[PDB]
Amino acid sequence: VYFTCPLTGATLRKDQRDACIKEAILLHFSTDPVAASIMKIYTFNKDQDRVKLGVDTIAKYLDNIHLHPEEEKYRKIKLQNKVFQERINCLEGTHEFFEAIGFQKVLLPAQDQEDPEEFYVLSETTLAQPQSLERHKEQLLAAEPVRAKLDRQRRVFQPSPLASQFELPGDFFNLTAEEIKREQRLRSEAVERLSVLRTKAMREKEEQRGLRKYNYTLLRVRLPDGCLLQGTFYARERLGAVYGFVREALQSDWLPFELLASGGQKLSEDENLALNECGLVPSALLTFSWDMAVLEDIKAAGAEPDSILKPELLSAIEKLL
Amino acid sequence: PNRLIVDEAINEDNSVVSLSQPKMDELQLFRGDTVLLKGKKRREAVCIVLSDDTCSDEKIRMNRVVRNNLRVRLGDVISIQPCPDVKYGKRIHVLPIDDTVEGITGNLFEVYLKPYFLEAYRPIRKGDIFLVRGGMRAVEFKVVETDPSPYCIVAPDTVIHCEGEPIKREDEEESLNEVGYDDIGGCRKQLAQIKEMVELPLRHPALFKAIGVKPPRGILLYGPPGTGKTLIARAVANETGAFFFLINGPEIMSKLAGESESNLRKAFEEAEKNAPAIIFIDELDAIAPKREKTHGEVERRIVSQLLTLMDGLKQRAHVIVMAATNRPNSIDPALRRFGRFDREVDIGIPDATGRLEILQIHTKNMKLADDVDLEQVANETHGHVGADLAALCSEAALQAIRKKMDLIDLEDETIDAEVMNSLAVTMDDFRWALSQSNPSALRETVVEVPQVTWEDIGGLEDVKRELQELVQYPVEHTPSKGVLFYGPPGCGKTLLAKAIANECQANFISIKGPELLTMWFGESEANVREIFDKARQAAPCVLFFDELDSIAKARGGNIGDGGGAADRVINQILTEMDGMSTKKNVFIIGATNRPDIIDPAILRPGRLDQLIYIPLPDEKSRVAILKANLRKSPVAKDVDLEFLAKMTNGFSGADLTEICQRACKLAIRESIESEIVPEIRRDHFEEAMRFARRSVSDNDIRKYEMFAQTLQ
Ligand SMILES: Nc1ncnc2c1ncn2[C@@H]1O[C@H](COP(=O)(O)OP(=O)(O)O)[C@@H](O)[C@H]1O
Ligand SMILES: Nc1ncnc2c1ncn2[C@@H]1O[C@H](COP(=O)(O)OP(=O)(O)O)[C@@H](O)[C@H]1O
């Protein structure tokens, strides 16, 4: 599976995504330290619920000094505060953001302890113009994690009759002693497994072994004109993205159609159902058919629907072997 | 390479096969792609491939219709060759097989072929035979012409043609209405045992022909009538291809001396000539009754003749003899000696799940109404066997037929397919049939997995864990194979034994006081062995002996007769327990409410070594008990279950249930009176609290505490 990194334009694999994006964000600090730290807070941290709480707590500290910019009590953000330690200090990139928007990290005496405590203290240069922090607050809160865009890799193929031309060896159906012993051992083990008295937890340990293999899917569509349309999707992608993909591939993107799944269930374009929920993962073939309403007018007018896909894709058609 | 062993289907559809995903990834084909399957005699079939979580990595799952088209059988190997070039068809000519179109007429396309293919996009090849079910008939068709060749996908714009006389079946074609494995519902474990013993020598005869090792010579199938003893024997023969010879007691016993023995040995000679073959002798107790139970010469001779013919199986290669009986002890013991019929399978009585599957099998061709609930039927048909569920479905069909035929008024030799197509069997027709059906296996003990789960038991968090450890330890890592429960009554002793069986999916065998007393009073304590023998056959199972002190009480309890703590029945139980190993997958649980009068032998090492005290529930447990009891009913928000639990300090779990049931009864009465309120209100619990009382006094609790401290 291939992706494009939005910060570099590079073509990456599924395992190379974080390495390239993280590097681009760390380099971006030379152009815009605030924008780079904002991308770092959302992108590096996998726990987005904590990121949302972290940036909301940071936004409150900035608004506190905005309300009372003349009072020194709101100029210093204590790094040991219970709310800071749980929401902000637990995230990567939050300290870089504070420094980027004019906060200096200093040690100040505590109001009740000898040991100095850590504070982020806003400088006079930025405090004089609250409009700077107000813009930086909105830039952080409106941000999203950076992720490489999935390349659909739209392709059309032409099946070749030669793909199914195969003759079996004369001894193909002559099974060996090793094949017979494995089958008879599986029969004896199956009867023994049915006889075993075990708890549900022991049953789950064995059954659960089949649950973790896939997170992407490849879909194919069989078209009336003999062409095969293929593309790449996330396993969690919604069925509406598959209809949009096919519409872009069709010669006429506006002409109503249906996509029938391999299990006999028709896919609804307006239904927010994931590919890994409807049984189209890790791969599946869909059957393409035009809506009956347009087929009646097309056939009644004497027009043969001999072209399904746009010439822009067909000019690059590959044969299957 | 690119070849898999043929296995049974899970999806009954005739156009699809299922592979394990790793092989679809190696073959680079997707779910829904069309592939060709290469079988024997240079034949092929076209189908759609899917995947599931159960297919073996090295096997392909396909149903009987697909296997017959390839002329292959379970255990064979076929090649998979994807064919993405398959195109949509323009015209396909399909004609029915004459063997299935008798008594039926009219337009078969509109009833069978049209809805079968319409928007189904099934791959079709010239020469394919496929089955369409409906109208209480199973009609199969053969494809005789395809405009594209040699195969295509049927589309909504494909012309489906059907003109001409029905096709006469070819001599190498088998009927799709023959008995196979897909016609057997419950008792899947027993069928698997038969497969292990029988399919190997029949599918792979060379394994035993080239060497001196012999396969099993015979299998005795026993259990109540109508459970599938003959159904299994026929299904195995038809699926493996072995010639099936049918013998039964009455057929041989009705003959005169000489003719009887001649017919019996002649069938054996025919089986050898037609080997591989299976000889099924039904009513074994009738053809070979116990010698000591007969005076006639013919009966003594026929037993000796069968014993010699069974021994001759050392020379009659690839012939296996199976027999059916009601009980292993109804036949002459000579047949059960080493060899002959030294292996037996307990078919038993289908449980609630098996009964549902059996009903679904008999409705394969039946059109059901939307209100039909076969699971509800299966739950009510307690004590029924497959033979009775077959009658149940047929009676429901006949009631539906009468209701419509009275208005149809069609008097002819055949029925138009459209007339049967519109006929459906509704829940009123199954309900009627249920009232007319009478179970044939109501007296025999019914053993199945209990429906009581851990969510139904309030409190006892530590006892739940202890039971899970006792069963899980011998599987994850001499371990104890049983536990005795003691303490006040009504705290969950029975529920604990059932709940552990439930979670393990183990069979639960419930022996109650009256059964132990029946054996004692009738001087039939030997029947204890049969109980333990059922536990072995039912394994995995939990063998629960309730009221272990029922006889000690019957003999006096607080006063006493001339004996001690031991009696005839417990002595047989103690003896039988010594013969059960920890590897038999049987967990023995006992319960008593009077440990001071139980034979101490039961707690000696090797038997009920674990001992669990079940006290009265505490406050947090009593709340859990009330909530569990009310999980099946609507309860108003004004009901304070914690307040009730605080008051019911001396109540057992059974006593808290009385409160819940009283409140339910009151809510029902009020609803009925108003109709002639929809939820249980605090007023119903406050009234119930006025009558419910603790069943266990403080003195009785002290009795249990003193016992616990006596044993430590
Ligand atoms: N376990 C079962 N599963 C499915 N059908 C069953 C089962 N047991 C019995 N039947 C049905 O009951 C009938 C059995 O009658 P028969 O062939 O005489 O066998 P038997 O008397 O040995 O049970 C058949 O119609 C069969 O379909
Ligand atoms: N721990 C418990 N949790 C919930 N209900 C209980 C409990 N103990 C007893 N009961 C109630 O008492 C009834 C009888 O329980 P049972 O286990 O049959 O008692 P015993 O084992 O003494 O015969 C059950 O229907 C159940 O509703």
Author numbering:
A (entry chain G): 121 to 441
B (entry chain F): 23 to 499, 509 to 707, 728 to 763
What does the primary publication say about this deposited structure?
p97, also known as valosin-containing protein, is an essential cytosolic AAA+ (ATPases associated with diverse cellular activities) hexamer that unfolds substrate polypeptides to support protein homeostasis and macromolecular disassembly. p97 forms homohexamers that enclose a central channel through which substrates are translocated and unfolded; each protomer consists of two AAA+ ATPase domains (D1 and D2), an N-terminal domain (NTD) and an unstructured C-terminal tail. UBXD1 contains three conserved p97 interaction motifs: a VCP-interacting motif (VIM) helix and ubiquitin regulatory X (UBX) domain, which canonically interact with the NTD, and a PUB domain (peptide:N-glycanase and UBA-containing or UBX-containing proteins) that interacts with the C-terminal tail. Here we identify UBXD1 as a potent p97 ATPase inhibitor and report structures of intact human p97–UBXD1 complexes that reveal extensive UBXD1 contacts across p97 and an asymmetric remodeling of the hexamer.
In p97–UBXD1open, a single UBXD1 is similarly bound but the interface between P1 and P6 is separated by ~8 Å relative to p97–UBXD1closed, creating an open-ring arrangement of the p97 hexamer. The open state features a modest right-handed spiral with an overall elevation change of 7 Å, largely owing to a 9° downward rotation of P1. In addition to movements between protomers, there is a notable rotation between the small and large subdomains of D2 in protomer P1 in both states. This rotation is particularly evident in the open state, in which the small subdomain is rotated upward by 10° relative to p97ADP. In the open state, the D1 and D2 domains are separated by 8 Å and 11 Å, respectively. These changes remodel the nucleotide-binding pockets of P1 by displacing the arginine fingers from P6, probably precluding ATP hydrolysis in P1. However, the p97 open ring is observed only in the singly bound UBXD1 configuration, indicating that this conformation is driven by binding of one UBXD1. Strikingly, the remaining 25% are in the open state with a singly bound UBXD1, indicating that under substoichiometric conditions, UBXD1 binds predominantly as one per hexamer in the ring-open conformation. These data further support the functional significance of the open conformation, wherein binding by one UBXD1 through multiple interactions breaks the p97 interprotomer interface and opens the hexamer ring. An open state was not present in the dataset, indicating that this conformation may require a post-hydrolysis ADP state of p97.
